[PDB]
Amino acid sequence: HRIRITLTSRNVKSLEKVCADLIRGAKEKNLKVKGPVRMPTKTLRITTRKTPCGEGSKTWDRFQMRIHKRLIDLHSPSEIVKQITSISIEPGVEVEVTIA
Amino acid sequence: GHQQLYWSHPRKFGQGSRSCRVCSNRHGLIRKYGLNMCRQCFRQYAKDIGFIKLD
Amino acid sequence: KSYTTPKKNKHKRKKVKLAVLKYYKVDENGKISRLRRECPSDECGAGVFMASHFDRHYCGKCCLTYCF
Amino acid sequence: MAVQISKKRKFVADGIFKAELNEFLTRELAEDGYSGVEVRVTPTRTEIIILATRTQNVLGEKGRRIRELTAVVQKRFGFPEGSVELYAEKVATRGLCAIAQAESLRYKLLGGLAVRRACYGVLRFIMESGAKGCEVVVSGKLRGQRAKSMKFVDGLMIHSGDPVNYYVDTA
Amino acid sequence: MLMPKKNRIAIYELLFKEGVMVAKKDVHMPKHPELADKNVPNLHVMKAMQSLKSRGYVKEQFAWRHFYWYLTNEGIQYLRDYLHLPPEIVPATLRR
RNA sequence: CGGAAGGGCACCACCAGGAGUGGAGCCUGCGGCUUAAUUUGACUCAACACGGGAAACCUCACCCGGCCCGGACACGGACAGGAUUGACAGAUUGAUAGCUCUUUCUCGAUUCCGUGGGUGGUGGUGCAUGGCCGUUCUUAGUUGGUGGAGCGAUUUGUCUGGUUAAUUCCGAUAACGAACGAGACUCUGGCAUGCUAACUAGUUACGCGACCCCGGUCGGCGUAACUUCUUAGAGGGACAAGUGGCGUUCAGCCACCCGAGAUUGAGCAAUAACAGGUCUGUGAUGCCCUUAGAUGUCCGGGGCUGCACGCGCGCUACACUGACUGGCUCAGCGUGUGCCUACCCUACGCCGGCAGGCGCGGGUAACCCGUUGAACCCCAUUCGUGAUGGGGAUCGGGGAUUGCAAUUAUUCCCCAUGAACGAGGAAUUCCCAGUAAGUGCGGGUCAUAAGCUUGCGUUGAUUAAGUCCCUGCCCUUUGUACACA
């Protein structure tokens, strides 16, 4: 009954639109909903030299990937979860649902 | 024979085991987060794998 | 380019015309004589023959040395 | 899952999966108007859609080539049988797709047309397609051994700042 | 080019049931990722389907590490003469 | 372009300074030398801890050697009475490479022998090129259409003046309408007890437990409210907005109140150009060269580190502001079990001084490391100006880890040896706010691995709010016998 849903997406507004969409979908069925827990993000720092050879001035890149994760807790069996999670999903968001 | 001297060198460690997955060179390899690809090929595909130069 | 040390030639493989004719000796009766041995190896029961070297017998491809 | 790698390695491996496919279809479907791919992640179903200009020319002999492209993903990436499927979809306003026009200019140069005359023929098509401006540069050696750089530019076209990442497309 | 006949008639059969098959560009590899059941050394098989191209029965494509062998319409009839298979059976990409 | 003039600007310039280098040791790269090879690219800014190049093999492109075709394909034979493959032995050898000499077994149209031919090349050519990067140029500059001028190259717009970091605007005006760039825009920082939310984050209360004399503490234990401390999302907030002055009173500028900010930092960045660098990044490549006794593949060893000398970036000291011995007490960026991949980060409990060795678990990661018990800092001894307990170069002996392999000491630990160096000449580098400087911690290269580099965090200032004096940059005028300027 204590089901965890993991919301990971690279885009900020692709994750933000689906994190509130599951709130709208679940509140129609009117069960116990926990709020979306905002946990600190992970950013991917890569710094490489711009010149393909070793000639010229020393300049460096700043290549980044910020990844965000949101956790929403549901107090429901898996029948309700399997219905809503198939509606309005976009490939930028990777959704992991844990029954336990 | 000839099979005993062709790939008898141990290549389970070091910089000779790893090479780029596009250029197959042994320099500038980004082993970080298991890209296993050189820095030079990292650039033209940086948008493709997904890094953005944000700051 | 030019080299000082002479090269190494290719090994001459001993091509034998009618090479199977020496394994058996034909007899006018209803029998066949096998001068060579029969290898007890698992991969080859009794058909594959073995080398008759100058020093001792040996079965070639199976890499199994036998001594008298 | 089996090896259960971290989420740091999960999104890194997805990017290389996208990047290797992007190198692949550029080298194989450029003659029939390849314009990009898009993955649709679903449980046990991996839908990847080939956004192509000429949808007629990519399906081939009764959809043989699309079925050929399915078997490539099955074997190189080790996906289970029936787990990944491919579709070809039409690209709206294909004149505004630079990678679709880059191979169009590439084949006009390769067909034997003049360097200049191939360049004008694309440019009045893309303003006919509704573009505010463009920049076309052909490098290399022209009319001799010495290298010359062409620059035949018209219209509104910016370079600097944030908007260049989504207001222009470069091939 | 003496990788023995036990290793041949499988890979044309392998190239028949799927018209295209993959291979990691790596000479020093005893096996295949796709064909992990048989020994089938990688370096000899690299010389197998390039000889298919050498008369012109197969195409070639590359993705950073990988030889891709798309069978041409000439290649089906070569497989019918070499393997003596009936003309009714078709590759999986020719069936829908 | 001017050692011509007038304006404006810059710590890759100065002023006033700070830390330094050059002075000593050591590390690293280059030149030179030498070697079989000490592979090579790069030589003012814009080469010299730069090719992410911290080379035992590989990397390696070099040398000494030794094997193989991985010469596909098309064509002439040779061929199943066999075209042709591997093989344990004796010497060969570096390897038990059938690689070769003797000597036979073995596979079976695949093959081998010649010609075209293709492949391979870290072979040459960046003064043939693609692509990428750097520099001109961090400056504010650059261009079209129409109209005007001149036969014309060209010019007006793109400006006399004011203002600005800005071709930033105001204002004039044979110029007008416009376009790139700057600005604008993206990320970060900072202020909101206002909104959303948290049992992988905590706070407050209840009830205990332990201790001390009702109260106090506990990373000791379970509960209900909350986001003040933890996180990230939507909004807000700052605009020269208000005031006093300067200014055509326009553009705008200075000061002050109020307010977390009355200039945070970085990204992006225009036209044209170098014959700048990269073919040794490529299954990017034109052309030239080799291709079977190969400039192709692979294996053993060496080398790229070699040392009369010079130079460049750096680390450690020359001490008492300190060295040593104890005790005390604080961080944030991050990262961590691999498609091939054979290799992760660590709690806790034992053995050994230590390097390290052995057991169990946790963590695919707000969960475990971790509350990251960091240096620095603070307190208390010894030393006593002594090349001294500064300093740790050189060097001897021993013990451990990774690796198939450490000798030319791979690294780590213990004892011992204890050099120069007493604040560094000519000359030269960087910087004005959490900045410099001091100091440690993450990531890269890593099997073994930071004197480098990339970020983070701690302690934390002196000086200056100006200038063209030098070095240079942007306009206007002027002159030229320069135009590869």
Side-chain angles (χ1 to χ4, degrees):
Chain A
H1 293 121
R2 277 88 178 182
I3 292 187
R4 284 85 170 93
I5 313 180
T6 300
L7 277 296
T8 71
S9 172
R10 277 265 271 280
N11 189 359
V12 177
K13 297 292 111 182
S14 85
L15 192 58
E16 198 267 333
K17 67 181 293 296
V18 299
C19 84
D21 189 358
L22 277 296
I23 301 172
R24 300 178 59 82
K27 71 160 70 77
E28 195 270 330
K29 312 195 72 65
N30 212 1
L31 60 88
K32 196 170 184 291
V33 182
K34 270 286 197 63
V37 182
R38 278 76 179 272
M39 61 79 71
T41 187
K42 319 173 177 187
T43 179
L44 279 297
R45 294 290 188 269
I46 302 295
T47 56
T48 73
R49 283 277 302 276
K50 315 198 177 188
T51 311
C53 58
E55 202 70 26
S57 69
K58 283 94 167 181
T59 177
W60 292 83
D61 291 331
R62 297 291 185 269
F63 280 114
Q64 285 149 39
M65 292 180 183
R66 68 180 65 252
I67 192 66
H68 308 282
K69 186 158 73 176
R70 263 77 166 268
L71 277 296
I72 300 174
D73 271 299
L74 277 296
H75 279 103
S76 177
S78 61
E79 190 164 53
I80 289 182
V81 189
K82 283 300 294 176
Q83 164 167 38
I84 299 169
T85 45
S86 52
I87 305 173
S88 75
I89 61 170
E90 190 276 331
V93 187
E94 176 70 61
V95 176
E96 294 293 328
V97 178
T98 310
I99 318 176
Chain B
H2 190 272
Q3 288 285 83
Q4 283 300 298
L5 280 73
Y6 203 53
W7 60 88
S8 295
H9 211 289
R11 312 296 184 178
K12 68 181 178 67
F13 48 81
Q15 61 268 16
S17 61
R18 50 185 70 95
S19 59
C20 171
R21 64 181 293 165
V22 186
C23 283
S24 308
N25 44 37
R26 259 83 183 272
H27 306 79
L29 267 296
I30 318 291
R31 213 178 63 217
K32 199 170 188 181
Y33 312 95
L35 277 296
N36 189 179
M37 182 179 72
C38 56
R39 53 185 183 89
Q40 293 179 356
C41 277
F42 174 67
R43 293 178 64 87
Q44 72 273 16
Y45 292 163
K47 182 64 70 177
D48 291 331
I49 296 89
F51 287 97
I52 62 170
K53 198 206 163 153
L54 183 63
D55 184 73
Chain C
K1 48 182 184 299
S2 63
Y3 310 117
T4 65
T5 305
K7 72 166 298 177
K8 193 168 298 171
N9 43 50
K10 194 60 187 181
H11 179 55
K12 190 66 175 186
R13 295 301 304 272
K14 181 61 68 63
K15 40 191 176 179
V16 185
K17 315 301 176 299
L18 284 77
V20 179
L21 188 149
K22 269 76 68 178
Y23 298 138
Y24 306 108
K25 270 295 296 177
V26 63
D27 193 55
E28 57 94 19
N29 293 306
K31 65 154 60 64
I32 43 173
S33 175
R34 308 160 186 174
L35 288 168
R36 279 187 172 83
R37 212 176 179 187
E38 306 179 306
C39 193
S41 180
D42 179 63
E43 307 311 299
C44 45
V48 162
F49 279 99
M50 73 291 291
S52 59
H53 276 300
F54 75 103
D55 62 358
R56 84 287 180 276
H57 281 61
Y58 171 68
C59 190
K61 58 164 188 293
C62 72
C63 195
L64 203 57
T65 317
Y66 284 102
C67 56
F68 278 130
Chain D
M1 65 182 179
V3 73
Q4 210 268 314
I5 55 171
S6 172
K7 298 308 287 187
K8 285 180 180 177
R9 302 191 52 84
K10 208 266 177 182
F11 276 89
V12 160
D14 291 331
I16 320 173
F17 161 54
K18 288 181 180 62
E20 193 156 33
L21 269 182
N22 280 294
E23 170 61 60
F24 175 59
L25 283 72
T26 44
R27 220 182 200 104
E28 201 261 321
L29 290 176
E31 53 264 53
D32 291 331
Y34 172 62
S35 298
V37 290
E38 205 187 325
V39 65
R40 177 72 178 88
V41 294
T42 44
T44 318
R45 180 87 269 166
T46 306
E47 170 182 58
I48 58 171
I49 295 183
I50 309 165
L51 269 299
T53 66
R54 280 182 276 124
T55 46
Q56 174 180 21
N57 299 60
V58 293
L59 61 84
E61 190 173 58
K62 219 173 303 178
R64 174 168 167 273
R65 217 201 286 160
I66 306 178
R67 286 198 303 277
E68 287 178 297
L69 294 174
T70 53
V72 172
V73 182
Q74 293 292 324
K75 293 167 189 302
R76 183 250 167 279
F77 289 117
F79 292 166
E81 275 78 10
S83 183
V84 65
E85 46 178 36
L86 281 80
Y87 303 102
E89 277 308 302
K90 215 165 190 175
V91 181
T93 180
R94 60 183 180 270
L96 264 72
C97 205
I99 61 172
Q101 300 311 293
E103 54 96 12
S104 175
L105 188 59
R106 191 180 196 268
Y107 292 164
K108 289 183 178 179
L109 268 297
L110 204 55
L113 191 48
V115 176
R116 310 304 190 87
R117 199 52 177 277
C119 182
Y120 314 116
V122 188
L123 188 152
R124 82 291 183 276
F125 166 66
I126 59 186
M127 320 290 173
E128 195 185 311
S129 185
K132 305 290 118 173
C134 69
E135 180 201 309
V136 193
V137 166
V138 178
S139 185
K141 56 182 77 171
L142 296 173
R143 293 188 183 95
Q145 303 297 298
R146 188 63 90 101
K148 293 105 194 172
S149 176
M150 183 278 288
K151 200 165 188 173
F152 182 76
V153 185
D154 72 301
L156 170 55
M157 183 278 288
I158 59 177
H159 304 82
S160 57
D162 171 62
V164 65
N165 319 280
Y166 59 96
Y167 264 114
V168 311
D169 74 323
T170 300
Chain E
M1 186 64 72
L2 273 183
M3 61 81 72
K5 210 74 169 184
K6 180 262 288 181
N7 304 295
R8 281 76 178 273
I9 62 173
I11 62 170
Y12 319 92
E13 174 169 48
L14 188 51
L15 197 56
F16 185 32
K17 64 90 176 179
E18 295 289 330
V20 62
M21 61 80 71
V22 299
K24 181 64 70 177
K25 180 198 169 187
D26 186 74
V27 56
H28 292 292
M29 171 87 255
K31 253 76 177 173
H32 284 285
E34 160 152 39
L35 196 55
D37 213 329
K38 185 177 180 180
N39 63 6
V40 64
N42 202 40
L43 62 84
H44 296 93
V45 177
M46 295 296 172
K47 295 285 104 173
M49 283 73 74
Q50 61 91 26
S51 55
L52 266 296
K53 173 168 283 292
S54 58
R55 302 80 178 176
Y57 321 112
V58 72
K59 293 187 286 185
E60 184 63 72
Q61 208 50 262
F62 212 70
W64 293 350
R65 298 294 296 163
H66 285 281
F67 291 88
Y68 292 163
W69 289 291
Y70 293 102
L71 199 53
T72 63
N73 276 6
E74 183 47 60
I76 297 89
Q77 190 164 46
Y78 180 26
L79 288 179
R80 286 311 76 63
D81 169 56
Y82 203 54
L83 311 170
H84 305 77
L85 295 167
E88 197 55 58
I89 48 175
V90 298
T93 182
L94 274 75
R95 188 270 299 164
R96 189 252 174 275

